[PDB]
Design a protein around this nucleic acid. Structure first.
Ligand SMILES: [Mg+2]
Ligand SMILES: [Mg+2]
Ligand SMILES: [Zn+2]
Lengths: 95, 109, 125, 124, 234
RNA sequence: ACUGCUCAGUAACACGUGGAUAACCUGCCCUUGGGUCCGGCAUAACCCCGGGAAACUGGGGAUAAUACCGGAUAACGCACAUAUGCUGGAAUGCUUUCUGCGUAAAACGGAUUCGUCUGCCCAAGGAUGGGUCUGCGGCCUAUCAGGUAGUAGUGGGUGUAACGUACCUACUAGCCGACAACGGGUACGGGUUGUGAGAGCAAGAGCCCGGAGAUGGAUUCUGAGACAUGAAUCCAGGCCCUACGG
């Protein structure tokens, strides 16, 4: 599975990084944890800190849209991000 | 009220103590100005006025003159005659059907 | 309560068939007529928190001399006459445009007591 | 047969009593605000002022209304009415201050005190 | 106080997508016809917050200012020439009406800049005051030098007068309606044509024409005193 | 009182459209100009006893607030004199005003990092909401010819948020109609839709704008706003819970 990132705008009004990238996966659309693990090494973002909102794969060609995000605080994520995103994004040791 | 400026339609040579008289009274005339002729003036301070125009019909591509009656306020200083061209402008409702007051009643020539 | 909505035929006598009910904003109150008695008023409310003062009885007036422009409060004794109704003179009703009799002199009411909350009468010259 | 409720203002203590017979007939006709001898209660010189009541079917008496029978009232506030909406009027069934044989409960308060205690003068 | 997707105003550039209501603007100081929600502005134009909840959060935390006032409500109206200031990036934007009558945003350079208003009815508050029918900011209740339609300029956020931009023949003028919106040009003749509706005005910039006096803004002496046009960022 | 639903009534300033309100009201929101002054002290849950089939709901005891009441500095109406301030055919309004005559508000409330933030009253204006107003545009019908007396208008009033026969009074004798009044038939109006090469012809269920309606009907409280789809009241009409008193 392969990833290339294009847009990394940082919102000054919240102190978070907007991660936009193209998922050049092969065959099976990768899960959110796997895409987070791959996207972490591209910009030095921990799993608890790096957050992804969608890995949306298109028809036909094995290319997907990844709208990931980065925060300088997990409490900031819990204050801003929705609870379904926090559940959907597995924390270190999460259940 | 009685004020002279460009396109004033100035106040007549006769003073009127009417309360709804536009020049001497206290009625602010404002709205859409219109023109017509007195159908009959057998009613106090109110001259029934007719507006005649034409509406081109789309399908037949021809014309049809349309009549219409309006009740206007006829102040005593103006005193619009019978069958005379007159210009009316809107005012607040004087009566049950009176929202226009005549301002210039020119006897036809 | 009175209805002040637009209901009086059209122009001809064809009876207007109402398509709408008696709306709340078209409801007018009762003509609280004023007479010569102990000075009585009520703070009736109206739209938008505007409690209009309505007077009912009064035997005093704010007679206003025009010769010197001095306002002095003198008692009302009798309505001399009235143009509006020929019966309010007999009833001693105090409507605007009537003529009252005070201690200062004969005066004409120049204030609507049902809307003004006071009886302000101009002293006739 | 009146199920009278008597309260003590000096301690906020209410004693419920079941009364019958000649004393109950004496209570009949005593309007709200009446003072009644303690011999009807057996209390040693304890005078009680009647300040309430209700019907067998739960209709509450009104001290305002004069008359023993029932009446229909279109009220907007006051005794025995609670507006579900702000400033809402309703037509309830109320009672007068007159005491009737179809009246069960008689709320009342102790006013003119007696020699002995309030509790011990009713066997307690 | 709702408004639907289809009946969105003609001055609202945002499309007709979604589900019925699109962010009902408050009563506010400005007209509802030429107004956009600050939430809709920050969620569509600038793209700093995507959700309505996150937009309400960022507004409520004192992060966006409208002429120095950090409005916490996402339904605040915006009128023409309004400045939005964001200190964290030094992003300045001005409400402008393009050639089709729609409201857009042009980026400015400096954070600190004036705001332009106009005179609409000079009334007299009791106390010897010449009330100018002000609607936003602070101002000066002045004298008869301040006439109607004078198009005053005032600082931000203190809103003190910078320069009385009184109009005359030949002075600059910006259109605020019609088919000539945004075609700023010099005034040619301000004729006080007496009539029951309103008077008229002659204006010619790149091309000459006749325009209505309620569709003219006295936006400068000869050149733009305010930062009129910066960068048209969507 | 915003949405939401319905499409009976309505052939109508209801509606589309252009103006008007200098004839008006506006809680929330908006900017500037001010102010935020003394007090009084009930009644809640709670305590003690219940009544009631239920619906409901009584008494005595304790007490608080941005609750509620009473007092001082405005607005409102009369009469005045005072300079273009808007708009401008255009004061009739704002008014510099002050004059005297009747004539008023608020919660120095709450929180804090004591930085400040948000609330109360007030004046002017805006905006928002809505009432009113009129030029014009759009059905079938003569096997529907006269219709109209508050009907048409004047003066003075009354009530209204406000103009108004909207109501009342004195008076005038008008008003609409044969270029279709009045009546019957039918219908939620328009944006539009159907169809055809087009001229037209036919329908305007759904999406948006405005209108009306809440079983039929009348009446009313509350509120800035209603005669309220989840308010009441009664009548008609049907139905329903009952310990038969409701
Ligand atoms: Mg009328
Ligand atoms: Mg009211
Ligand atoms: Zn005249």
């Amino acid at each position: 599975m392969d990833i290339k990132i294009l847009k990394d705008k940082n919102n000054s009004l919240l102190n978070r990084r907007e991660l936009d990238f193209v998922v050049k996966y092969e065959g099976s659309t990768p899960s959110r944890s796997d895409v987070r693990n791959k996207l972490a090494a591209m910009l030095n973002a921990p799993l608890e800190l790096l957050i992804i909102q969608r890995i949306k794969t298109e028809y036909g060609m094995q290319e997907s849209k990844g709208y990931a995000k980065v925060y300088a605080d997990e409490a900031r994520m819990k204050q801003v991000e929705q609870e379904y995103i926090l559940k959907r994004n597995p924390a270190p040791g999460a259940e | 009220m009685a004020r002279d400026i460009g396109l004033n339609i100035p106040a007549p040579s006769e003073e009127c103590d009417d309360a709804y008289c536009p020049f001497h009274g206290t009625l602010p005339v404002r709205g859409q100005i219109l023109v017509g002729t007195v159908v009959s003036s057998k009613m106090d301070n109110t001259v029934v006025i007719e507006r005649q125009y034409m509406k081109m019909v789309s399908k037949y591509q021809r014309y049809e003159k349309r009549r219409s009656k309006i009740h206007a306020h006829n102040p005593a200083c103006i005193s619009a005659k019978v069958g005379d061209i007159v210009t009316i402008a809107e005012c607040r409702p004087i009566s049950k059907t009176k929202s226009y007051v005549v301002v210039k009643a020119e006897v036809p020539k | 309560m009175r209805w002040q909505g637009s209901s009086r035929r059209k122009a001809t006598g064809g009876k207007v068939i109402t398509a709408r009910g008696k709306r709340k904003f078209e409801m007018g109150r009762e003509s609280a007529e004023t007479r010569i008695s102990e000075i009585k008023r009520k703070k009736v409310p109206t739209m938008g928190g505007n409690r209009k003062v309505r007077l009912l009885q009064s035997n005093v007036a704010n007679v206003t001399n025009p010769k010197d422009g001095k306002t002095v409060t003198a008692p009302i004794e009798t309505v001399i006459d009235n143009t509006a109704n020929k019966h309010y003179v007999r009833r001693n009703i105090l409507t605007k445009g009537s003529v009252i009799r005070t201690s200062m002199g004969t005066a004409r009411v120049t204030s609507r007591p049902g809307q003004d909350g006071v009886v302000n009468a101009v002293l006739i010259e | 047969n009146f199920k009278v409720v008597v309260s003590d203002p000096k301690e906020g203590r209410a004693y419920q009593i079941d009364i019958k017979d000649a004393e109950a007939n004496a209570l009949i006709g005593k309007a709200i605000g009446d003072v009644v001898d303690g011999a009807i209660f057996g209390l040693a010189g304890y005078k009680v002022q009647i300040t309430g009541g209700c019907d067998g079917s739960g209709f509450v008496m009104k001290p305002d209304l004069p008359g023993p029978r029932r009446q229909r009232i279109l009220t907007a506030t006051g005794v025995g009415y609670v507006p579900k909406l702000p400033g809402q009027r309703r037509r309830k069934m109320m009672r007068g201050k007159e005491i009737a044989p179809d009246i069960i409960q008689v709320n009342a308060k102790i006013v003119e005190y007696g020699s002995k205690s309030i509790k011990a003068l009713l066997g307690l | 106080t709702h408004q639907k997707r289809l009946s969105v105003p003609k001055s609202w550039k945002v499309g007709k997508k979604g589900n019925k209501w699109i962010s009902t603007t408050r009563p506010g100081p400005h007209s509802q016809a030429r107004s956009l929600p600050l939430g809709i502005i920050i969620r569509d134009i600038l793209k700093l917050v995507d959700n309505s909840r996150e937009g309400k959060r960022i507004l409520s935390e004192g992060k966006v200012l409208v002429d120095g006032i950090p409005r916490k409500d996402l339904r605040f109206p915006v009128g023409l020439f309004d400045v939005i200031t964001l200190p964290l990036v030094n992003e300045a934007y001005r409400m402008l009406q393009d050639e089709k009558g729609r409201l857009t945003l042009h980026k400015l350079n400096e954070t600190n800049v004036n705001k332009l208003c106009r005179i609409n009815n000079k009334t007299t508050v009791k106390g010897g005051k010449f009330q100018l029918n002000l609607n936003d900011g602070t101002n000066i209740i002045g004298s008869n030098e301040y006439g109607t339609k004078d198009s005053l300029i005032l600082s931000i956020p203190d809103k003190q007068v910078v320069k009385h931009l009184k109009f005359e023949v030949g002075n600059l003028a910006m259109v605020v309606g019609g088919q000539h919106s945004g075609e700023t040009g010099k005034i040619m003749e301000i004729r006080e044509v007496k009539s029951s509706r309103h008077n008229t005005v002659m204006i010619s910039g790149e091309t000459d024409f006749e325009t209505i006096e309620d569709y003219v803004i006295v936006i400068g002496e000869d050149k733009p005193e305010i930062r009129l046009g910066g960068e048209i960022s969507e």
